[PDB]
């Protein structure tokens, strides 16, 4: 099924973006005074925070490339949620229409 293929891919791409995201954030932010997004464990928590949009504001990037990273993480999280939701809708719709004989 295309929808599960798409939902599966995005969820693997998301994990990859969260990991590379953590790595790249630290690389982009070290060098910038006042930057807090500068060790891998907290940076990875930051990435999860960001992908989900949970907005604690305990950590955020202060640099251009940190912020670019942030956006790729947001979009990957947002994209994968839309593809999961759309896959869940496709599943339910095709199952409801077989539950009607249609």
């Amino acid at each position, epitope marked *: 099924a295309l929808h599960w293929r798409a939902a599966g891919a995005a969820t693997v791409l998301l994990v990859i973006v969260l990991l590379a995201g953590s790595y790249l954030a630290v*690389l982009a932010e070290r060098g910038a005074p006042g930057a807090q997004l*500068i060790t891998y464990p907290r940076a990875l928590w930051w990435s999860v925070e960001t992908a989900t949009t949970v907005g604690y504001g305990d950590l955020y990037p202060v640099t251009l490339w940190g912020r670019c990273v942030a956006v790729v993480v947001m979009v990957a999280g947002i994209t994968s949620f839309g593809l999961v939701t759309a896959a869940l809708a496709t599943w339910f719709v095709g199952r409801e229409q077989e539950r009607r004989g249609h």
Partner: antibody
Amino acid sequence: QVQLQQPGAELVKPGASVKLSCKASGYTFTSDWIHWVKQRPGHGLEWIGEIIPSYGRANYNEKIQKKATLTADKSSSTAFMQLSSLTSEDSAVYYCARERGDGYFAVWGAGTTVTVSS
Amino acid sequence: DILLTQSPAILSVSPGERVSFSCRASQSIGTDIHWYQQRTNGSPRLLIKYASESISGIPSRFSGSGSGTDFTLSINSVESEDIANYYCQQSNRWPFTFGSGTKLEIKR
């Protein structure tokens, strides 16, 4: 075993330039940073800069006069600090240390004593 | 850029007493503070990471506490091998910074 290897000493003439080395061993990850720290005799520790060797990116203490340039060889896993145009203010023990990207210096080298004199 | 203040600069204690080194940060840094011992002519050695987390192969009499801006290294039952300079270091914000150190002197 000894995790970070540095020369014991380096003598340098006023105005001259020296390239210090820090050979690493033990567990290595692409996420490791090598830091350089300066100690003038009788004084404290002073952070100079850091490098991520598996990416070549280096950052420096912008609050002091920039004497250092950091480089790395990924195949021999050596970190280099090029110190240049040295005066006697630059005489000190320079340590290298390893950080696993988690904020603390788990292992240190024994230090290189740099003396600047004619 | 985070300033770490260490008080006092020299601590004189009696053998067997419990000793405490102070490290005050210029702004709130969670528990992102680490401690080092540097004996005479030796290189620094990590004693405590993240304010209170023990390190393998460090005597059980070294401990740490604190959070925010106030941090303490304690030694239970001080002894001769503890004679050394002690530094704190923060990793909360770029750049990493060190305190200025406290020397431990023993009154025998």
